[model samples]
Target: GPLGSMDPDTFSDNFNNRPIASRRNTVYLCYEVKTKGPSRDAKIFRGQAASEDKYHPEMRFLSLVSKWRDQEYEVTWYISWSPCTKCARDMATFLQENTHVTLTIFVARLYAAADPDYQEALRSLAQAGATIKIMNYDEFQHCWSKFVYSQGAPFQPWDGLDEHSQALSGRLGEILRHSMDAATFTFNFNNEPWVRGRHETYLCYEVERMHNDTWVKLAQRRGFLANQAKHKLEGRHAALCFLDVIPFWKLDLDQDYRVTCFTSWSPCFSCAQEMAKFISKNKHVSLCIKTARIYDDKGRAAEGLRTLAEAGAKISIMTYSEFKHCWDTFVDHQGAPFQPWDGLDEHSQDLSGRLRAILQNQ
Candidate 1:
């Protein structure tokens, strides 16, 4: 079936006309807020995403530069046109501060899935402290559908998406039809944003209205308006959203061997029992799956430790104090670290519930 003459504009136009303050000639696509299914709006989005910026000036300074590398390198980045470079810098700063989150235990799961021979690998990591989330793969597909695939996007290059932005639309369709939510690996941390449903966010940013001496408020204001118009035109209600932060952990049946890490498991039997239940249910595939696999025994222990070395459950064995310390460090930088997003909404704009009541009373 033809997707029609899809225009990236309906989706990509948000970045074309607006240049960030102190920036020039560059354009960006804020893929965070996206849509799904083949509606006229979705088509329009695709069209705009693939179109030229109508407001391109001679100084096209905002160039979107994206690339791919092994697990250790910078896997994702955005582009924008501005002398300020604030968007890129801010995002980079956020990532730089937060990427330190290490996930050695999840890496062990990857190895365990790769080979049963590494039950020791699994045990070692499990003992070191890792967990199995009895996730139905279908839920991930659903989440992806709601968040990425159905939105008519290519898989994210970060994990599920392609380097060119093509998504696993075909794969997702199959997952959704099956009604499943396969257990996937993640840091498994929690948060209290006070919003309902959206438990954790990929990242949050506070809108900064000034940069240097320039009136960046105008640009930021325009950015918000563009986002609002796009949402309203598409009849979308502003709601909280989140992403499957660790896409690699959801892989199915693509491992080369079994892996485990059992040096010394956590002693809390109740916690262990809770963890064991998930273990009993999951099947560690034994094939040389590389699509989402990143580390192995030797590589993991070496200087080759994952960039997110401290993020996995394995680190839990280090001690409660250690766990809290590492967990807090990452949480500080993770998931849209800080946000004053309320004012942007047409509804309540209070960081605390106080302001919202005032609006409701009116």
Candidate 2:
């Protein structure tokens, strides 16, 4: 939507100087990739600690390939605005092998409703990979619950129990109100409060010609009765800590841009189709779609996936490899097809000038 006015000169200026916006003007989110191998340098993070200062615009990278009449075209992409398509491009002579880069954005609990690119962009990446692991806000809420109760440490005190004493002490019975002051906290572990209503996650892994066709879902594999069920939930929460919460927590402190939304059946086979229609009609806002992934709970994901798109949103689905390809965009990090507007280091205070410094010598 902001793109209509973003001409080449303006877009170029914004990309090169990293001007026009910052954490104050936008929201920055993080995501983690769990690969078969280790690739840590691929991780680009914010440099400063929380108290000093935290504000910067968010950015990501992608490499798109297409061919027509024996001629092949390669474009390294870094998107700024959706409607404007004023993306900065870096055409490289080659692309790395076996890589799928994904963008897992962290938003305010309800901000996904406003994001137009969240699911559509992920869909594009899924075409290239297996399953793009979109970040789930509720997982982080679970983490916060763990963090507050674990006495600043990260973990559930109970060895094999989901019933950790609410660190602040009280029943997480209803999605009602907070007992203390300062900030409000909602304690809905299983689902949102009955009165407030609960929403579930929906799957959106698209099957294409090149698809491997193996199932790779991020789900609550275990059940309440199973030993690993609680652990499975903990794993998802841990993944959220490293992947989604940490990155933005470093660059932006303003809670305004941070967003989260209700889970729905938008990405399910049928739900995704309807969700696409809703997104087509509701253009101009940022968007992201994540599934509940509760394997044990038969709460109807397909139905939920369709609900999101019906409400107007873009969405994507992927298999194993396709999802991995999207997630690995930031891995290897060397000779990346494309870099952030100011280079990826803008998120980190420690690496603030690192990327610029590297390019200056080049």
Candidate 3:
């Protein structure tokens, strides 16, 4: 069924002439399909997506076009909000496999574009042969002509439309430009550290660069990194966030980096795999992980630690000296000596022994 035609008021209210379009919670999509045959520049559909039914505009667009396959077609979309991370990934993957379809997307506003993973997703879409661009006044007018129900009235350009478009365009350019210069990766690592549903993770890290034969500590910091709750950093895990930081901070990739981490609890299986992939790419970087406890030390945890060991990361239990060291460096003890909790030694020895056993077979 065709969607209801937009009235002038709906058009003006929904597709405002702004750089970052408002009402982002609802996405407006204007679409056209041009086939290799007689149907050239065929206006297919214009629609909206919302949380009411939990439907995504991109998915709807895919379903709409799913039948128009096995033939070459050029599809263009003028969208109020850019695709989210998952949508971008799925769209890109689809375009990659379907060589007969050509896609162009003109987005008015970016969706959660500041997040690194989201930014990476947009890059992937571009890599898959989609002409991704920010919508300017010309395209906005074009979309109005094709999408809205204007009765003989010309589409008027709103004030500051060019300015807003330029800003969004520049930001989009930066996101895609760097993607060409270098590559970065993000892993799900969804395995959480929780105690009856409340989850918290703290990672204290020291990134040291080698000078001649000696390693110099160049970075040291610590703070509360949590699961979801719109954490200070986006949803990426603590270690994966560190991996994202290493390259952007301009740490010399050619120089050797000795990274040591002290975690409240050891990384989960997924995080362990993410770290393994990170280290595998940057051979100059070496890792030493000293943790307070082995989190979920069941079969899964052992496999993760073992994989990390194979990636050349040293996994060890945190001892009294190490615990105190973190307190001195990572915590504000207010000039107080570090105090040990009961059974610190017992747990450390047991965990350390288990870690050895994990790597012993190899």
Candidate 4:
């Protein structure tokens, strides 16, 4: 199809003015007005997406509809890229307010299907009675002949489209695998104290080189509280959101360091992106993330942690020894060392074994 090399400029009137090879990948909005007898002449319009702006094409189409002031029209949108989360929400709102309009969207490519927020937004659009589908070969051909000023050049099949789409799917699968693995590793940790109510949890650890022996702290003062808030010098208790604060620490990036972060839940998608970028930049800084649960009940935690694990973050469940280590090092007791309760060994063994299985399979 013409979508393979479709440029943003192809939708402009300048390209439609003369006969040439038609390239696809533009927004085409057609409004078909219906009467008691037959359908009236449809108003066809084109718009180009602004750079890094997902709402541009949809906004332009909405403006055109407003200008025409059609009481009732069936809208057909031919899009190179699917509407993003924000655009999808906006479209759903439009549909809700404009009950006289029906929308049909044909997209050549889904822009951000891997993002859970995007998927939720798309579901909202569907619920709002918007018909959405991937652009088929027939639709591509129809758009090529109808919208473009091509000089009788037949529509060419995008032979590589399937391969490209398959590759994208494979990448998404890889990310999912990484995410599942990370979640499995993080969820088994014994960081229950860090977990309070929802959204109130954090974990942190530091790497130190002390005279022939190295040790790890819970990252209490500088690595933890300093990053949390300096003025509020309360006790060493704070909801971590540790990933957000990790990159901001004024540490020696040149020295090799490993951070062990325990949390009640795994990192979300945005935090995972930040962690990946931070790890990529600071090669010496490695992360070992352990969690007891995911951010929400939704299974999207895998999607978020996929990038973190892919960027070489070591994710694992806290074993019995690690749990004891955290207790002995961080938790306050009556001047006594850490002690395991009944069935602690059995639970640790089961969690460790399950973590291993997930790591292998994922």
Which candidate gets the maximum TM-score versus the true structure?
A: 3
Tell me the deviation in Å of residue 115 in model 2: 8.2
Candidate 2 matches the true fold with a TM-score of 0.20
**What would the per-residue lDDT of candidate 3 be over residues 1-362, giving only the tens digit for each residue?**
23645666766765653523353467667776666557655556555443333444434656555545466767888766777778789889999987878899998776532454676678889999999998887897887787777889898877878876775675566467541111100011111223342254556577777897898777432221223224212465666655665554466767788888877667888889999998898798889988766687465878888899898998887888887676565443446776565666776787778768877852
What TM-score, over all chains together, does every model reach? 0.17, 0.20, 0.47, 0.39
**Residue 184 C-alpha lDDT in model 3:** 8
Candidate 1, 88-125: lDDT as tens digits? 23333433443422111001001101111222233333
| Predictions in order: lDDT | 0.23, 0.26, 0.66, 0.52
* Cα lDDT for residue 280, candidate 2: 56
Q: Better model by TM-score, 3 or 4?
A: 3
Task: Report how far off residue 294 is in candidate 3 (Å).
Answer: 44
Judged by whole-model lDDT over C-alpha atoms, candidate 1 comes out at 0.23
Position 222, candidate 3: lDDT: 26
How much lDDT does candidate 3 score? 0.66
Q: What residue runs in model 1 are displaced by over 4 Å at the alpha carbon?
A: 1-323, 328-362
Question: Which residue segments of model 4 deviate by more than 4 Å?
Answer: 1-71, 113-116, 163-362
Backbone clashes in model 4, listed as residue pairs:
1-157, 1-158, 186-291
Q: How accurate locally is residue 107 in candidate 2, as Cα lDDT from 0 to 100?
A: 21
lDDT of 1 at 119: 27
